[PDB]
Amino acid sequence: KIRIKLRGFDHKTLDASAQKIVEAARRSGAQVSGPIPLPTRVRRFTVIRGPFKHKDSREHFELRTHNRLVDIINPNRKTIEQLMTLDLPTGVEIEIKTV
Amino acid sequence: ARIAGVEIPRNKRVDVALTYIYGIGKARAKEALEKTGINPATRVKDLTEAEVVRLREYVENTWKLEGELRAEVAANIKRLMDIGCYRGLRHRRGLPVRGQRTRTNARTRKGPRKTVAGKKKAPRK
Amino acid sequence: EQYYGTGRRKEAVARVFLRPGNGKVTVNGQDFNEYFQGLVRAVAALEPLRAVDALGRFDAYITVRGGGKSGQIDAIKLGIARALVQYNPDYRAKLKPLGFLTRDARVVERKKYGKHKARRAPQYSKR
Amino acid sequence: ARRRRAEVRQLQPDLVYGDVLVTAFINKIMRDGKKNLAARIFYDACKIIQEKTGQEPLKVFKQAVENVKPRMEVRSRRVGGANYQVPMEVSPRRQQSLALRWLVQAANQRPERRAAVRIAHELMDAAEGKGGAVKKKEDVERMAEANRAYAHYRW
Amino acid sequence: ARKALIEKAKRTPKFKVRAYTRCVRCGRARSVYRFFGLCRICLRELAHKGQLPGVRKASW
Amino acid sequence: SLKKGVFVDDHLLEKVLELNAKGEKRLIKTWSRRSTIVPEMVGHTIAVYNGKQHVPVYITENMVGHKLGEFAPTRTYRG
RNA sequence: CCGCCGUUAGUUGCCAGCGGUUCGGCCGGGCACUCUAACGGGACUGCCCGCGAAAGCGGGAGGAAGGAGGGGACGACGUCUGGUCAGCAUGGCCCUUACGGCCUGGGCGACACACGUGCUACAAUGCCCACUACAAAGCGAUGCCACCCGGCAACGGGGAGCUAAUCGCAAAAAGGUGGGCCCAGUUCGGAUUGGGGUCUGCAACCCGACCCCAUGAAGCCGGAAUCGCUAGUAAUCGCGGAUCAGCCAUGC
Numbered sequence: 001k002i003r004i005k006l007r008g009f010d011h012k013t014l015d016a017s018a019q020k021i022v023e024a025a026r027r028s029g030a031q032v033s034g035p036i037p038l039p040t041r042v043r044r045f046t047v048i049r050g051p052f053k054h055k056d057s058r059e060h061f062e063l064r065t066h067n068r069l070v071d072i073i074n075p076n077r078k079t080i081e082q083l084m085t086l087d088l089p090t091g092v093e094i095e096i097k098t099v
Numbered sequence: 100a101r102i103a104g105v106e107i108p109r110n111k112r113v114d115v116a117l118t119y120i121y122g123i124g125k126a127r128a129k130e131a132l133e134k135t136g137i138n139p140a141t142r143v144k145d146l147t148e149a150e151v152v153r154l155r156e157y158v159e160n161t162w163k164l165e166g167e168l169r170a171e172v173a174a175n176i177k178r179l180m181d182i183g184c185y186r187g188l189r190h191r192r193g194l195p196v197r198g199q200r201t202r203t204n205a206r207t208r209k210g211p212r213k214t215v216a217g218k219k220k221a222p223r224k
Numbered sequence: 225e226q227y228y229g230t231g232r233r234k235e236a237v238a239r240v241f242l243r244p245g246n247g248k249v250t251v252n253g254q255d256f257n258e259y260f261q262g263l264v265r266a267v268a269a270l271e272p273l274r275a276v277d278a279l280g281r282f283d284a285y286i287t288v289r290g291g292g293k294s295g296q297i298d299a300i301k302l303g304i305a306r307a308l309v310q311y312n313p314d315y316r317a318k319l320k321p322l323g324f325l326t327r328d329a330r331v332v333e334r335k336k337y338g339k340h341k342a343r344r345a346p347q348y349s350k351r
Numbered sequence: 352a353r354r355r356r357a358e359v360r361q362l363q364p365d366l367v368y369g370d371v372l373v374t375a376f377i378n379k380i381m382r383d384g385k386k387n388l389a390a391r392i393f394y395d396a397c398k399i400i401q402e403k404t405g406q407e408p409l410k411v412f413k414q415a416v417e418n419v420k421p422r423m424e425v426r427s428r429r430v431g432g433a434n435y436q437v438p439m440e441v442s443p444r445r446q447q448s449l450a451l452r453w454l455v456q457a458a459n460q461r462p463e464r465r466a467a468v469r470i471a472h473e474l475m476d477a478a479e480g481k482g483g484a485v486k487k488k489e490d491v492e493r494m495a496e497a498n499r500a501y502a503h504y505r506w
Numbered sequence: 507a508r509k510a511l512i513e514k515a516k517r518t519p520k521f522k523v524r525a526y527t528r529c530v531r532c533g534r535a536r537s538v539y540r541f542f543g544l545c546r547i548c549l550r551e552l553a554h555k556g557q558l559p560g561v562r563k564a565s566w
Numbered sequence: 567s568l569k570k571g572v573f574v575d576d577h578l579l580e581k582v583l584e585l586n587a588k589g590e591k592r593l594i595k596t597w598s599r600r601s602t603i604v605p606e607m608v609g610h611t612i613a614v615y616n617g618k619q620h621v622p623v624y625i626t627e628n629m630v631g632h633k634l635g636e637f638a639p640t641r642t643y644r645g
Numbered sequence: 646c647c648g649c650c651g652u653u654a655g656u657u658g659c660c661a662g663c664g665g666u667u668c669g670g671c672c673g674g675g676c677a678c679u680c681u682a683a684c685g686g687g688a689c690u691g692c693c694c695g696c697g698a699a700a701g702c703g704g705g706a707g708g709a710a711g712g713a714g715g716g717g718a719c720g721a722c723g724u725c726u727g728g729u730c731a732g733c734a735u736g737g738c739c740c741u742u743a744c745g746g747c748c749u750g751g752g753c754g755a756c757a758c759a760c761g762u763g764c765u766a767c768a769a770u771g772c773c774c775a776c777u778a779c780a781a782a783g784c785g786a787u788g789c790c791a792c793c794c795g796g797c798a799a800c801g802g803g804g805a806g807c808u809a810a811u812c813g814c815a816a817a818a819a820g821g822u823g824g825g826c827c828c829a830g831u832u833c834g835g836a837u838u839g840g841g842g843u844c845u846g847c848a849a850c851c852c853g854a855c856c857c858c859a860u861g862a863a864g865c866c867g868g869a870a871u872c873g874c875u876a877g878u879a880a881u882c883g884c885g886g887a888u889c890a891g892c893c894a895u896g897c
Contacts, residue, residue: 003656009560015683019653034654037682039810044783044886045539045561046337047546052728055897056338060564060718061553066682067810071656091559095808099656112825115832125832126858140825168859172839178628184636185851192644194756195837198852199893201756207837207862215758223760226661230678232648234877235781239678241661259778262821263387268366285661289679292779293820320708327648327709330877332781333716334566334646337897342716344879347872349761352875360876382770383881387820389770464828466770508731510746521847523890534732540888547732565718566646569800569843597749600848617751617851633850635750640851645756 002075006068007093011040014092018068021083025070028078038067100146102155104165108143116143117154122164131157227282229306231299233328236291240284240303247273247280251300252288263294269301272308272324276315282308302327359444367394368409372416375448379455380470389466396471404475414478419450421488423495428506437505438495450488457484508533572631574602582607595620599635614638 004021008014018035025032043063048054072079087094100107108116118128132139135154137146158164179187179196186196193209194201206212231238249270250256260266273279286303288296305324309316319325333342340346363374373393380389397408404411421441428435458469460483476482512533515525527538529545537546544552552558575598583606585594592610599614609625616638623637 011683033656036655039657039681041809042783044564045541045549046564046887047537047539047549049550050729051547051732054728058337059550060337060566061561062564062566063560064562065560069654069656112832115826118832121861122859124859124861162859164859168839172860175839181628182623182637183639184629184632185639185641186636188639188641192756197837198754198850200754202754203756203759205756205837209757211863212758217759220759226677228661228678232679235647236779237679239659239661241678254778260821262778264366264390287659287661287679288779289658290780294779296779321706325649325709328877329648329715331647331716332877336717341874341879343874345873346762349872351761351871357875380770383819384879385770385819385881392770464769507746514747521890523846523848525890527888529732532732536732537888545732551733563718567843567849573848575848599750600850602850615750636850638850640751641755643755 001098002070002072003097003099004068004070004072005038005095005097006070007095008066008068009064010092011064011066014066014068017087017089017092017094018070021070025072025079025083028082029072029074029076031073033071033073036069036071038069040064040066100143100151102151103158110142110144112140112142113137113146114139120164122162122168123158127162227307227311229303229308229310231286231288231301231303231306233298233302234291234295234330236295236299237289238296238299238303239287240300240307241286242282242284242304242307244281245283247278247282249284249286251284251286260293260297263297265294265297269297270304271301272304272319275319275322275324298328370409370412372412373409376412376451376454379451392466393470395467396474399467399471400475411474411478415454415474416447416450418477418480419453419484419488420446421450421491422446424491425494425498426506428501428504435501435504435506436494436498437501438498439505450484453484453487457482572602574604575600578604578607599633599638601634602631603629603634605630616640 006014006017008017015035015037018037022032022035042065044060045062046058046060049057049059102117102120104121106120108119111119114125114129114132117123117131118125120128123131129139131137131154135157136150137154176187176190179190181187185198189196195205195208199205225243227242227244229240229242231240251259253259257266270279273282284304284307286300288299290296291299301324305319309319309325336342338345362371362378364371365373367373377386377390377393380393382389397411400411401408406414423438423440426437426439428437454470454473454477457473457477458466461469461472463469463472473482473484477484512528515528518525526535527540527543528535529538529548530543531552532545532548534545538544539546539549542549542552542558553561553563577598578596578601581594581596582604585591586606593613594611595613597615597620599616603625605627607625609629611622612625612634613620613622614635614637615621617640621638623634625637629637
């Protein structure tokens with residue numbers, strides 16, 4: 001019944017936040033449907049290499065937003081307690097809901 | 100089979116056939132070809148008075164064509180050529196009222212581009 | 225019961241189920257010979273069943289999403305290949321020399337900044 | 352090239368009979384990349400040939416293609432500040448290919464209105480020889496056997 | 507003029523249709539990728555100098 | 567274009583409707599040229615700006631509800 | 646990034662396998678398959694044979710992958726006082742109630758020609774109206790805007806869902822499947838032209854896009870010359886994003 005989405009720019013750590021949760025949650029309760037990866041939406045940007053009227057000569061840059069999704073079963077007090085308390089995203093965005 | 104302005108289309112499907120007349124494009128044509136009967140597909144070939152004559156009645160009683168239609172144009176052109184507006188200004192100057200291109204193109208509106216002389220060019224090399 | 229293969233070509237993909245029966249084939253709904261009433265490559269894609277002349281013994285059921293009509297066709301071929309090269313890899317012996325597994329290439333390449341179709345370049349002046 | 356002798360790359364092993372010849376023809380007929388459309392035009396032409404003439408399609412195909420297939424052409428060579436109209440025998444593939452082209456543009460020359468008509472007509476009268484494509488064949492054969500003074504004056 | 511121009515829009519005048527974006531890390535309106543509130547040269551100086559998250563010297 | 571309505575401006579309005587309180591002097595001095603010509607201006611010496619100076623244009627009928635600053639040239643020099 | 650396989654993982658996908666159904670993944674169920682997006686393995690002339698002293702080359706196979714697999718970012722030492730003081734900083738010279746600042750107007754769109762990159766074309770492998778098809782990527786909260794309705798339309802009034810793999814932009818188009826045109830300045834091509842409409846915005850004259858219906862030029866496939874492109878490349882066809890009230894975007 002739990003809808004936890006994790007939006008991330010560093011896919012390395014962002015995934016590390018995806019399985020971690022699942023351990024202690026599969027631990028402090030019952031099943032926790034696997035972290036399931038979700039379409040890393042990417043915002044395409046680009047511009048030219050310099051300042052002066054140089055139509056060619058360009059560099060592309062884009063935003064890598066990886067989506068994560070954890071579903072847990074019927075929650076428990078330990079689970080909810082620690083796994084709403086402890087964290088260290090240091091940036092990464094954590095948004096949950098009751099669907 | 101003169102209808103208006105001595106205009107007879109001859110062998111050709113009635114739609115495009117009457118389309119061959121000024122004052123009538125695809126719309127006003129097919130429109131007429133319902134509001135006076137007449138099958139759009141069926142050619143001008145085996146036509147028959149009543150419906151041809153009445154097509155012609157639909158032409159004039161409803162809207163105008165040819166001479167007056169262009170007289171209207173030119174007279175309101177005179178409306179642009181009675182004060183001296185930009186429209187009329189460049190209507191005289193041989194130029195379009197769209198303020199777009201007067202630098203290069205617009206040769207649709209003042210004959211072939213008749214060479215100046217080149218005037219000799221800057222440091223182009 | 226199930227003799228399945230995977231198809232995928234020119235950015236498209238076909239879930240190639242093949243059971244047996246009368247060897248008649250229909251895919252993604254509509255009858256095969258109406259789904260693709262365009263390109264002649266149609267029957268050509270069904271070459272592997274015509275490689276052993278067993279065109280009508282194995283019942284295929286394919287799910288091809290993406291690419292185009294022809295791309296679909298490509299992935300279909302790919303799978304009909306892979307499926308008979310599973311539930312009888314005896315058919316693999318005489319199908320690679322025939323080239324029924326080399327997947328694909330093709331990509332309308334990443335458009336080159338500066339040129340058009342990543343190759344197509346603007347008319348060069350010099351002057 | 353210069354450090355290489357290049358690549359040939361197989362043509363479509365035909366989806367109809369199986370003849371690469373047919374797909375080469377189809378391709379030359381094809382315009383703007385829609386292989387299927389023009390291919391259809393050809394096939395229509397074919398079934399017409401075999402609802403009209405006796406001998407089967409690929410037969411008419413071979414007798415026409417053969418009734419072009421030019422061997423000795425002209426090319427060019429270096430001479431200080433001039434040119435050598437070098438008559439030379441052509442590689443079989445080049446012969447056959449350009450020949451196919453000549454079938455196509457022979458369908459071009461025509462005052463024909465529909466495509467299948469042009470292609471069919473040509474394949475018929477060129478299986479025969481009554482065509483501008485064979486005319487230009489023996490024309491490049493004049494060119495060859497009329498610049499033949501440049502026999503061993505090849506590049 | 508320049509200095510006065512940034513101030514012109516910095517304080518929203520009369521009509522909605524007289525605002526124009528401004529590179530607050532260089533100071534112009536031309537090609538200011540509004541998403542970042544940065545011009546194109548300001549954009550590249552930021553992303554390059556490592557002072558811009560979420561990006562990537564893209565290689566797709 | 568105003569789809570439902572016709573754009574004009576109130577400078578002219580207040581002005582015209584106050585000389586209409588009598589029918590006085592044969593001059594008005596307007597700076598707006600974006601405005602649509604109206605028939606209640608009667609149409610004497612509507613002195614409009616151009617880009618360099620105010621240049622009086624006459625107004626009667628056929629300039630009905632079409633824009634003012636159109637009978638003020640601006641685009642000087644011809645061809 | 647892209648092609649083959651794997652393990653984690655299952656609100657994308659599905660009878661693939663079962664139940665039912667408003668038979669429309671629609672209702673339960675399931676991770677098989679697509680997919681998603683992660684962590685690796687996989688290709689080195691490694692194997693086989695003939696040649697070369699070797700470097701390499703020929704032929705064949707194993708394999709999704711051959712001999713650098715396709716692409717991308719990647720660009721030295723250096724030149725060229727290249728380009729840029731109008732993005733920025735910047736040494737100096739310089740106006741300082743004027744070269745500073747605001748406002749409203751007007752130009753940056755002007756026209757006797759010339760030129761580069763371009764869109765469209767000049768036509769039956771085509772133009773036109775009807776039915777069905779397969780796209781990939783990128784978007785959308787004071788924005789995406791399906792729906793009925795008013796309007797032929799431009800779009801407007803009431804109105805669903807949507808911090809999106811679940812809602813909408815959105816119809817891909819050519820393909821295919823029917824019917825029309827019959828070789829013609831043509832149902833070609835719309836360049837331009839008039840009397841009216843929609844939308845944004847204080848405001849659409851200069852100088853906006855878009856709608857209507859009437860206008861319907863040149864254009865019969867381009868001389869000297871000259872450009873592109875070596876594989877899913879060219880040619881053809883549609884699609885999005887950037888910035889943006891709007892839109893001159895046929896540009897990128």
